[PDB]
Amino acid sequence: MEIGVPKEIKNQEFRVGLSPSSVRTLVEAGHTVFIETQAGIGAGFADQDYVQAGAQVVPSAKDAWSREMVVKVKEPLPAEYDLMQKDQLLFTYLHLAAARELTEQLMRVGLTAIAYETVELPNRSLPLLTPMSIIAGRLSVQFGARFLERQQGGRGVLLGGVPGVKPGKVVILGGGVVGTEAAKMAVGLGAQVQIFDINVERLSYLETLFGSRVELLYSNSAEIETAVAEADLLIGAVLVPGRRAPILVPASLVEQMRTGSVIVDVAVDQGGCVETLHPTSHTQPTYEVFGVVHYGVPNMPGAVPWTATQALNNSTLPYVVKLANQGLKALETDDALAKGLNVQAHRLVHPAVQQVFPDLA
Amino acid sequence: MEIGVPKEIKNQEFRVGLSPSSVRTLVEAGHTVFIETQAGIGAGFADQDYVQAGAQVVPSAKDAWSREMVVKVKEPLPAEYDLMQKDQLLFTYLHLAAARELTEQLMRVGLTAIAYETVELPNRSLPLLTPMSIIAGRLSVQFGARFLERQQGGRGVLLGGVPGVKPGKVVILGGGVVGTEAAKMAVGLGAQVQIFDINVERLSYLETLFGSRVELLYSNSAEIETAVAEADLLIGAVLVPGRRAPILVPASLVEQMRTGSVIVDVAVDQGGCVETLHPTSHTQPTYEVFGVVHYGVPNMPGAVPWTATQALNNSTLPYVVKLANQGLKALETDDALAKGLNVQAHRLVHPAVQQVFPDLA
Amino acid sequence: MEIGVPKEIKNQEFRVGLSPSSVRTLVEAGHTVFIETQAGIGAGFADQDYVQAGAQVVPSAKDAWSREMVVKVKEPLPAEYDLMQKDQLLFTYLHLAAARELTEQLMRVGLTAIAYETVELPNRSLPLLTPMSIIAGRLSVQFGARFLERQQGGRGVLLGGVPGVKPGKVVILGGGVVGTEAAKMAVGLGAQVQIFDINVERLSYLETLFGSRVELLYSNSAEIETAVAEADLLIGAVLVPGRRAPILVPASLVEQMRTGSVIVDVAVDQGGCVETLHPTSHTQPTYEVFGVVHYGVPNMPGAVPWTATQALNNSTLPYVVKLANQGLKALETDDALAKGLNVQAHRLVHPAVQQVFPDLA
Amino acid sequence: MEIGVPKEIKNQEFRVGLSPSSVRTLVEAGHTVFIETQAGIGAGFADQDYVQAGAQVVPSAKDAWSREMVVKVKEPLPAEYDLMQKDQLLFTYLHLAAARELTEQLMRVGLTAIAYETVELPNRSLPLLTPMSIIAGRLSVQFGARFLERQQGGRGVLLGGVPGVKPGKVVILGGGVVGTEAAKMAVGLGAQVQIFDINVERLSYLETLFGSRVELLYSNSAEIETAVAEADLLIGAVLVPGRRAPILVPASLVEQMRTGSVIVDVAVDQGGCVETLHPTSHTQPTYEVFGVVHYGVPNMPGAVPWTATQALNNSTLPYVVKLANQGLKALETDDALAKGLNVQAHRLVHPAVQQVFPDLA
Amino acid sequence: MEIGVPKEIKNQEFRVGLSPSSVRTLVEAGHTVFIETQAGIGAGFADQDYVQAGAQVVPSAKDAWSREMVVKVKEPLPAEYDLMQKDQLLFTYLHLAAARELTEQLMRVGLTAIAYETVELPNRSLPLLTPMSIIAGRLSVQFGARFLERQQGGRGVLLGGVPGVKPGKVVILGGGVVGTEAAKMAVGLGAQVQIFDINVERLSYLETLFGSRVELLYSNSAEIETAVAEADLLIGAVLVPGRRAPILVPASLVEQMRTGSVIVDVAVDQGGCVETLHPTSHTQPTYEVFGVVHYGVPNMPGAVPWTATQALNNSTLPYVVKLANQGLKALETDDALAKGLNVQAHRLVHPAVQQVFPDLA
Numbered sequence A, B, C, D, E: 001m002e003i004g005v006p007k008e009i010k011n012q013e014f015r016v017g018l019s020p021s022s023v024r025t026l027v028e029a030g031h032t033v034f035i036e037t038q039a040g041i042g043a044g045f046a047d048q049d050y051v052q053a054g055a056q057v058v059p060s061a062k063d064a065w066s067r068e069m070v071v072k073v074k075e076p077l078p079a080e081y082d083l084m085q086k087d088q089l090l091f092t093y094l095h096l097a098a099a100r101e102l103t104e105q106l107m108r109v110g111l112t113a114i115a116y117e118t119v120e121l122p123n124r125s126l127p128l129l130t131p132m133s134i135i136a137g138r139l140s141v142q143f144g145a146r147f148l149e150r151q152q153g154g155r156g157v158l159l160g161g162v163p164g165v166k167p168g169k170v171v172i173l174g175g176g177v178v179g180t181e182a183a184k185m186a187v188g189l190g191a192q193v194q195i196f197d198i199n200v201e202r203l204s205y206l207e208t209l210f211g212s213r214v215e216l217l218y219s220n221s222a223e224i225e226t227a228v229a230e231a232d233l234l235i236g237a238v239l240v241p242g243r244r245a246p247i248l249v250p251a252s253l254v255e256q257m258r259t260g261s262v263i264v265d266v267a268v269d270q271g272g273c274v275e276t277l278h279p280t281s282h283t284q285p286t287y288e289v290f291g292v293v294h295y296g297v298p299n300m301p302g303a304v305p306w307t308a309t310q311a312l313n314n315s316t317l318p319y320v321v322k323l324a325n326q327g328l329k330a331l332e333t334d335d336a337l338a339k340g341l342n343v344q345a346h347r348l349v350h351p352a353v354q355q356v357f358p359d360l361a
C-alpha cells in the first residue's frame, strides 16, 4: 500500500511517524513509503537514512498527506485540514475528547481515524501509551536533578550526596509504570527513595524489583504529610481510571516543604495530584509557589525524540503492517485495532468520545 | 579564638566557609564565631540556623574580616583587599600560582595564608580537593543528560533507553576519582559505559567496583578513536601530575562524532584532553563545534552549594579546629597543614608558588 | 502397579527414565519397579543406588519391557519393536509426526502411548519440554566458549576479557526460555550481551531480570544486521508456533561476520534461524562456512545426563505416579495427560499427528 | 629505534609480541617496527592491520631477528639460535633457570636479555605475569565445565543445575589471583563455591568481593578432606614463594572423589598441589585416575591468543617504549626493568639464575 | 457510622483493631470512632495519637462494644459475650470452625460477623492473612538465630559465620509466602540456604528472586533426608489446601540431626510437617527432643505488634471503609466481603463452618 509520513508541525514536536528501520521493514513487506523531506531530522534521522531504507522522499506535506495511509505522532492541525482525503487511513495520537473542531473535521472529510491511545488489549492495557509512560518516568528524575541545582532555582542538593553527607530525598506518589521508572533512576543517582501506593499487591511486586533499597509505603494522608515535608524532590505519578486525579498534596502541605525543593507532577493531564501545579511553558518550564519549584511541562517524552521515536515504533509497527496488509479488514481481525477506531465515514464510532460529544453521535 | 566568616562575593559562588554544624562544633571547643548576615543563604543556611549554633551574626564583611582567623571558600578579591589584617590567619582556596596581584597583596599585608589545595598528605594526596572531585564526577553525568535533550541542543537520547531501544553510550577518559564517580552515575541511569585509563592496576581495581557492567579499556589512541566516534556522551576526567593534560581527543576525532552528541571535560584547568574545548560562561554554558555540544563551565560543584558546603567542611573542620586551638603552632605539629602554608609575614613560602614567581621569593 | 525401565539404546543417549529418588518415591506409593542393569550408569546412577531405592534390578531389556508401564527417555527403536506388549502404557518422548514406521508399529501392537512432548497445560505450555529448554540455553554458552578457543577453531577470545581488554560480544536471537538462560550464563562469564525479541512485553520482563546489564533490542532486520556483524558468539533461540523458524540470518550476513566467530543455533529442529546451519555429528560437532564456526548438534541436554535426568523426573514424576495409581482413568481426570495421548488400541488419537498422517487416522 | 617481531615458532603458540595497537603507539613515538608476515594471524591480526598501524611487514624471520630490539612471547628456540645478534635487546618470557643450553647460548652471543617474568616491583609483584594468571583463573572453570560433560569423560553435571536440581560443587584451593578469577566464573555459571586459603586477611578481602555467595574457608587438612570428597570440580590455584607446591590433595583423597569428577590444577609448574596430577598433552589433554578426570595442560592462556596478546601488551608496552627510547639506560632509570635483566655481554646477571647455574656465573 | 475499637483482652495479644492513621482516614470519610483507653498502647500508639486523629477515646470496653461496628484483631472471648449487641457488625479474625461455643454465641446474639480470614478473592487468595504470613516468615529466622545461641540452648552457631569459618545451614521446607520471606532473611544474615518445594514452577519463580545464591530443590524424601541431617536451622513452611500438613520430617529423621540444632515450624495449626513438634507456651517457648530445640509458639506476628498492626490495617482498611459507607449492602457489592460473612441474624452462613457444625446450619 502507499504510506505517507508528513513532517510534524506542532510546536516543539520533534518525533516522526516512522523511523528508518520501520520503513525498511515496511518496504520488505511490499509497501512503499513517502516521507516529507526533513521529517526525521529533529529525531536524528537524515533523509539519506530514509532513502537507504527504501523510502521515497517527497518535497512537500501535500505529497505526504495524499496517501492511502498517513502515519504521524500528533493530531492534525488546522493548517493541515485541507490536506486530508476522503478515504485515508489516519493512524496517530488524536485525543479527540479534547478537540471538538478536530473531531468535526475528521467527520466532514469522511476518512477513518485510528488513535494510538485507544488501541486497547483485553488486558484493558493501552499498548501504545506505555512506551511514553516509561520515558516520562525516567525523565522526571533527570529534570528534577536539574532543578535542584542552585542556578536553576533549587536548593543546591546533589541527589546522591557524597560519603559523609546526606543524600537527597525523593518521594514518589504512585508506584505504577511511571512511578516505578522514576524510582529506578533515583536509586541509580544514589537518592533515598520512598514510593507510596494504595495497592498493596503492587507494593509487594515492587519489593521484588528493589528489595529493601527503597521504602515502600501505603498511601495514607498521615504518612504522606510527613514524607512530603522532608522531600527534596516530589514526583507525582498517580492515575485513577474513572476520573481525574486526587489531590494528595494540598497547597497547605506544599507550604510546609523546604525552600528550593522541587515538584515534578507527571500526572499533568487529568489534573495532577498536587494542588498548586498547573501546566507550564518551555520558555518558562517552571515557577515557584512558597519557594518550591514547580515543573508542569507536558509531553515529557518530546525532550528525547531519538529515543522516543523508536520506542513508539517498536510498538506501533506491527499495527502499521497489519493495516497496510489488510487495510480496513484488520479492524475485523484485530480487536485492539477495532478499539483504536474513532472515526469512520463521517460517523463518530468511539463510545468514549461519544459520551463526550453526545450530540456528535 | 575569634573566627570570622564573610559572605562569598565572587560571581556565582554560593558556598560558605562554615556550615552551622561546623560552627556548633567550633563553639563547643571554646571558640567564638562571627558570620556575616546572609553568608549562608545561597547554600540553604539561614542566619537563624547560625544563631542556634552559637554564632554571632555580624551585619558587615568588615566585622567578619576583622577576626584573627577568617574561613572562606574562594580567594579574596580586590574589593576585600582593604579588609585584610596584618596578623590574620586566612584559610581558603587560593590558587596563587595564577594570581600574582593577589600573591603580592597577601605579601604586603603580612598575614599568614593557608590554601586548602596545598594541604597535602605523605600519601601525596590533597585531602581538601577530593570532596570537590567526587562532586564534579557525579555532576558531569547529570549535566550531560540535560544536554543530550533536544531542546538543550543535543541529539534527543535518553541515557538508559527503554527495553527494545539502545541505551546511550558514555565514554569516560580517565578512571580516577572523577571518572569513577561519573561511571557510577551513568551506570545508575542505565547507560552503556566504557572507561579508559593508562594504569592497569587502577583498571583492575575498578573491576572490583563494577564487575562486568562497565567496559574497562586500556588507553591507546587506536581504541580511543573507535570508542569516541560512537559516543553520545564524552567525559574528560584525565589528570597527569608533572603538567597539563594530554589531548586525547583532537579536533579531527571530534569531527567524526555524531551530531548532537555531547562533551563534558571536567579537566578544564590544566587544559582539557579535548582539543576543541575551552571554558564557558553561565549565561552560555555550551557551544557547538561540528554539531557537537561542548560544556566547559568550571567549578562544577558550585551548582550544588548545599551538598558542596558540607562535603568541604567535613574535610576542613579538623584543620579549622587545630588552628583555632594551637594557632600558628599547628603548622609545627601538622605536616599537612605546614604544606598548606603559602604566605607568612611578607614572605612567599610555598616552593611551588616560588618556582612560578621566582622573583617574588 | 509394575513399572519397567529399560536401558536407553539410542546412540549417545545416557539419560534414564527414572532416577533412584523417583523410584523410591514410587515404591513408597505401593508400586514396584524393574530396571535393567546398567540402565542408570551413563547418568551416574549405579544399580546399587537403585536397589537401595527399592528397585528390582533385571538382567535384560525383555524383563524391563514386559511391564504394564514402561518409562523411558527416547522413542522405541526397531531393535525393541518385538519387546513391546499389547496392553502396555508407554510414557516417553515420541516425536511421532517424524516417525511413520514407529507410528504404525505402536498402532499394530495396540498399546497406549503417551508422549512427554504433547502433555500440555491450558496455559498451552508443554511442562515436560521446558526442563530441556532451560538446559539447552545454559549449555549454549558453555559450548560457545569452547569453540571460541583457538585450538577448537575459533578466534581465541575469552568471553569475559580482562580489565583493559574488550570482553566478547554475545548476540542472542530470541528472548524466551532458551534465550534467557543463555543470557544468564553469558553475563556470568562477563560478556557484553544483546538480546533481540519481537515481543516487547517479553523485553520489558527481561529488564526486570537483568536491569541495564544486558542490551534489550527489538527484532528488526536493520539492527540485527549490525549486531551480528560485531558478534563473537551468535546464539539462535527463536521459536514460532504455527511453523518453522524464520531465517533471521542469511548467508550474506554470515559472510560479514569475523573469522573465528561462532554460531550456536539451538533452534535446530524446525530449521534454525540461520541460513548456513545444518545438524552436525558428534565425531564432528562443527564445521566452517566463511571462517565462522557452526555448531548444530541437537539434543544438547544429552551432554549432562546426570543433571538432565533429574530435571526431567522432577517434572514427569507426578504424572508417572498418577498413571501408576489410576492407570488409564488418569487421562479422564487429567486434561494435560489426556493431551499427551498419542496412540491407543490401534488408533491414532493425537490430532496433530493425524493432520500429518491423515491416512493413518 | 628499530623493533622486530618474529612469528612465534613454538608448538601451539599463537600469541604475538606486539599487537597492531601497540605498534601504532610505537610508531607515533618515533620508532619503526618490522614484523614477519603472518606473525599475528594465530591471534587474529592480519598483516593488513599491521600495515595500517605503520608496521613494515617483513617476509622472513631473519629480517625480524636482525633488529636492535626483538619483542616476542616465548623463549628463542634452537632453530633461531643463528638468527640472534651480538648487541640486540631481547625482551620476552625466558624461564632461564630451566634452560641451561639456552642460558649458555645467550651468553655466547653477547646480547642483553630481559625476561618478562623477572621484571618486578618493590611490591615484589611481577607485573608481567599477572595478566596471565587472571586468564588462567578464568579459563580453569571453562575447561572444567567442558570436562564435566559426559562425552568429554565427566559425570554429566551442569555447573548451574536448574531450579529443582542441585548445582555443581566447585572447590578452589588457593584464593589468590588465579583462585579469585576462577571463583568469579564459577559463581557466574551458578555453581556452589568454596575457596580455601591459609591467609585469613586474604579471606576477609574476598568477602568484600563475593559477600556470602561463596564459602570462604581456612585451609586445614580436615576441612579439605571433606570438601574435596564432595566436589564435582576441583581447581588447584596454590602458590608458595620459597619453593614448590604443597600436596594438599594426596592420591588417597583423590580416590575418595566421585567418578567423573574433574581436577584442574593450574599450579602445574612448581608441581601442583595434587599428587596424581602431571602435565598433559594437547592431542590428549586429560587422563583418568580412579575415574577422576585430570587436566594438566600448561600455558592455559594460549587457548585465547586474541585476548591474551592484548592483555600482555597492555602491561609490556610502557616498558617496550622506555627501552626503545632510552635503550640500555632505561635499566638505570627503571628498577623493575633492571630486575628483568638476566643476561648481558656474556655474563649471567640474574641472581636467581646464578644460584641455579652457580658455575655459569 | 459509629465505629468502636475495644482493647484486645486475649493473653499476649498487643495488636489493635485500628491504628491512628486508619482512624484519621476513617474520620475524613464522615465516620466517628470510639476507642477504649490504652487499646493501642501494646502496639506503641498512645491515646494522644488517637485523639490527634479524630478518635473519641472511651474509658471502657462497654463503650467501645456498643457501636454499630466493632473492629478487632482476635475473636471475642467469653468475658465479652455480654458486651455484644443484636445488630452489630463484627469484623475480626474468628476461626469459628474451632470455636463451637463462640459460633453458638454469635448465633444467639443475632449480629453479623465477618471474619478476616474468610474474605477471599476469585484468585482464591485470602488477602487478609498474607500480611501475617509475610511477618511469620521473617520472624522465623530471627527466632531461629536466637535459639542457635548457646545460652538459649542451641549449638552456638552464628548463621553468617566469618570469613574462614563455615556459615550456618538453613533448610526451608515449602517455598511459598512464608518460606520465601524466611529465605530472604537467612540470606541477609549470610547463611547457606536450601528451599524445597513440590511445585517446580514456584521453584523457577524463586530463581528469579534469588538467582544462584539459594539452592532450589524438588521436594522428595531422599533429598529431604540428607539435607535435614546437615541443618543447623530447619524451618517448616508447608501448606496444602485440602487438609492438614504432611509429615515431611519423621521423628527418625529428627533423631539424625545435630545436637543443638533448631526447628521452627511455622505450619503449627494444621499440624506441622514435623512429627515431634507441638505448640509451646511463652513462659516456655521451646523444648528438646534428641538434643534438638523445638519452637512451636503460634501467632508469631504478635511479637511485633507495631509492625503487625499497620500491616493488617493496610489491608483491612478499604474493607472497613466500604462497610462503614454501605453497611450491609457492601456484601452485595463486594464478593470478597460476601465471602468473609460467617454469621448473620442467628444463621450460620459460611459453608465451610457449616460442613464442620453440620447441625448448626
Ligand SMILES: NC(=O)c1ccc[n+]([C@@H]2O[C@H](COP(=O)([O-])OP(=O)(O)OC[C@H]3O[C@@H](n4cnc5c(N)ncnc54)[C@H](O)[C@@H]3O)[C@@H](O)[C@H]2O)c1
Pocket (backbone or CB within 6 Å): A132, A133, A136, A173, A174, A175, A176, A177, A178, A179, A196, A197, A198, A199, A202, A219, A236, A237, A238, A239, A240, A245, A246, A248, A266, A267, A268, A269, A270, A297, A298, A299, A300, A301
Ligand atoms: N507528562 C507526560 O509526558 C506523561 C506521560 C505519561 C503519563 N503521564 C501521567 O502519569 C500518571 C501515571 O501513569 P502510569 O502509566 O504510571 O499509570 P499506572 O496505572 O501504571 O500507575 C498509577 C499508579 O497510581 C496508584 N495510585 C492511584 N491512586 C493512588 C493514591 N491515592 N495514592 C498513591 N498511589 C495511587 C495506582 O495504584 C497505580 O499503581 C497518569 O496520570 C498519566 O496520565 C504524563
Ligand SMILES: NC(=O)c1ccc[n+]([C@@H]2O[C@H](COP(=O)([O-])OP(=O)(O)OC[C@H]3O[C@@H](n4cnc5c(N)ncnc54)[C@H](O)[C@@H]3O)[C@@H](O)[C@H]2O)c1
Pocket (backbone or CB within 6 Å): B132, B133, B136, B173, B174, B175, B176, B177, B178, B179, B196, B197, B198, B199, B202, B219, B236, B237, B238, B239, B240, B245, B246, B248, B266, B267, B268, B269, B270, B297, B298, B299, B300, B301
Ligand atoms: N571543573 C571542575 O569543577 C573540576 C573539579 C575537580 C577536578 N577537575 C579535574 O578533573 C581531572 C580529574 O581529576 P581526578 O581527581 O579524577 O584525578 P585522578 O588522579 O583521581 O584521576 C585521573 C586519572 O587519569 C588517568 N590518566 C592519565 N593519563 C591518562 C591517559 N593518557 N589516558 C587515560 N587516562 C589517563 C590516570 O591514570 C588517573 O587514574 C583533573 O584534570 C582535575 O583538575 C575539574
Ligand SMILES: NC(=O)c1ccc[n+]([C@@H]2O[C@H](COP(=O)([O-])OP(=O)(O)OC[C@H]3O[C@@H](n4cnc5c(N)ncnc54)[C@H](O)[C@@H]3O)[C@@H](O)[C@H]2O)c1
Pocket (backbone or CB within 6 Å): C132, C133, C136, C173, C174, C175, C176, C177, C178, C179, C196, C197, C198, C199, C202, C219, C236, C237, C238, C239, C240, C245, C246, C248, C266, C267, C268, C269, C270, C297, C298, C299, C300, C301
Ligand atoms: N537442540 C536442543 O537440544 C534444544 C532443546 C530445546 C529447545 N530447542 C529450540 O530452541 C528454540 C527456543 O525455544 P524456547 O523454549 O526458548 O521458546 P520460547 O517461546 O520460550 O522462546 C522463543 C522466543 O523467540 C521469540 N521470537 C520469535 N520470533 C522472533 C523474531 N523474528 N525475532 C526475535 N525473536 C523472535 C519469541 O517472541 C519468543 O520470546 C525452539 O526453536 C526450540 O525448538 C533446542
Ligand SMILES: NC(=O)c1ccc[n+]([C@@H]2O[C@H](COP(=O)([O-])OP(=O)(O)OC[C@H]3O[C@@H](n4cnc5c(N)ncnc54)[C@H](O)[C@@H]3O)[C@@H](O)[C@H]2O)c1
Pocket (backbone or CB within 6 Å): D132, D133, D136, D173, D174, D175, D176, D177, D178, D179, D196, D197, D198, D199, D202, D219, D236, D237, D238, D239, D240, D245, D246, D248, D266, D267, D268, D269, D270, D297, D298, D299, D300, D301
Ligand atoms: N598453567 C598456567 O597457564 C598458569 C598461569 C598462571 C599461574 N599458574 C600457577 O597458578 C598458581 C596460582 O598463582 P597466583 O597468581 O594465584 O598466586 P597468588 O599468590 O595470587 O595466589 C596463591 C594463593 O595460595 C594461597 N596458598 C598458599 N598455600 C596455601 C595452602 N596450604 N592452602 C590454601 N591456600 C594456599 C596463598 O595464601 C595465596 O592467596 C601458581 O602456582 C602459578 O604458578 C598456572
Ligand SMILES: NC(=O)c1ccc[n+]([C@@H]2O[C@H](COP(=O)([O-])OP(=O)(O)OC[C@H]3O[C@@H](n4cnc5c(N)ncnc54)[C@H](O)[C@@H]3O)[C@@H](O)[C@H]2O)c1
Pocket (backbone or CB within 6 Å): E132, E133, E136, E173, E174, E175, E176, E177, E178, E179, E196, E197, E198, E199, E202, E219, E236, E237, E238, E239, E240, E245, E246, E248, E266, E267, E268, E269, E270, E297, E298, E299, E300, E301
Ligand atoms: N505460626 C504463625 O504465626 C503462622 C502465620 C502464618 C502462616 N503460618 C503457616 O505457615 C504455612 C505456610 O503458609 P504460606 O502462606 O507460606 O502458604 P503458601 O501456599 O504461600 O506456601 C506453602 C508452600 O508449600 C509448598 N508445599 C506443599 N506441599 C509440599 C511438600 N510436600 N514439600 C515441599 N513443599 C510443599 C507448596 O507448593 C507451596 O509453595 C501454613 O501451614 C500456614 O498455616 C503460621
